[PDB]
Design a protein around this ligand. Structure first.
Ligand SMILES: *[B]([O])([O])[C]([C][C])[N]S(=O)(=O)[C]C1=[C][C]=[C]C(C([O])=O)=[C]1
Length: 244
């Protein structure tokens, strides 16, 4: 019996109190709902940042450029983050957002095939440019929050144009939280190489009864913010709406 005005005010306040500007899009069946404190972001284009790892993984697995148990060895060079200085499967690299592993996968796929596959899936503006190893971080590839929640909807329902097994393999890599009987599958993104910086958390809730509710959070990341604010705003929003 909570009013829509109250849900909208509560979710807006989560973004306001984080001192940022953002939106979260929820999809139930075919119907989109937009909440947050900067609703016009819903149809604006931003780099996908590490949310692209979901599609990179699907492309690399479908095209036999990796397997799910393959261990990508750390080459022993210093990484931006100490946690990336280790050997990882694609799933472990998904959880750590380990850019170097997914850059290796993108190089295995190669520019020609990557561009064909990104165009085949019709992801965002579909443009990868000439640099196979950073096009999701600094452009030219861009996508809107509406497009990201629709991509999440497709993956959650096995509707992307990849084998069912490929989609199930990647979905297994995305489980980030279990709340009561709900499961949250999602991938974060933080585009630190663009100005202003973009933050994402895109995925879906699988409820105990089997319904899947996709979402995409998009906000501006600011100096000194914690990445966990993306998760915190998302979970508070999903809980306020009774989705978890
Ligand atoms: B993603 O989560 O959006 C990815 C990993 C956090 N984001 S990022 O590429 O912008 C983080 C980063 C910043 C500077 C340099 C590197 C690197 O060494 O690849 C990564």
């Amino acid at each position: 019996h909570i009013s829509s005005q109250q849900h909208e005010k509560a979710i807006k306040s989560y973004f306001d109190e984080a001192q940022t500007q953002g939106v979260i899009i929820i999809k139930e069946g075919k119907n989109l709902s937009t909440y947050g404190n900067a609703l016009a972001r819903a149809n604006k284009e931003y780099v996908p940042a590490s949310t692209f790892k979901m599609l990179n993984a699907l492309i690399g697995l479908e095209n036999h450029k990796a397997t799910t148990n393959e261990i990508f060895k750390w080459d022993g060079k210093k990484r931006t983050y100490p946690m990336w200085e280790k050997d990882m499967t694609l799933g472990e690299a998904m959880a750590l957002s380990a850019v170097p592993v997914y850059q290796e996968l993108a190089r295995r796929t190669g520019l020609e095939l990557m561009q064909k596959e990104v165009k085949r899936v019709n992801f965002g503006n579909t443009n990868i440019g000439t640099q196979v190893d950073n096009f999701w971080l600094v452009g030219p590839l861009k996508i809107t929050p509406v497009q990201e929640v629709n991509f999440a909807d497709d993956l959650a329902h096995n509707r992307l144009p990849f084998k069912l097994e490929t989609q199930e393999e990647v979905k297994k890599m995305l489980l980030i939280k279990e709340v009561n009987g709900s499961k949250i599958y999602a991938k974060s993104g933080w585009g630190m190489g663009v100005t202003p910086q973009v933050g994402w958390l895109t995925g879906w809730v699988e409820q105990a009864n089997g319904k899947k509710i996709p979402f995409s959070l998009n906000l501006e990341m600011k100096e000194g913010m914690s990445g966990s604010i993306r998760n915190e705003i998302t979970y508070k929003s999903l809980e306020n709406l009774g989705i978890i």
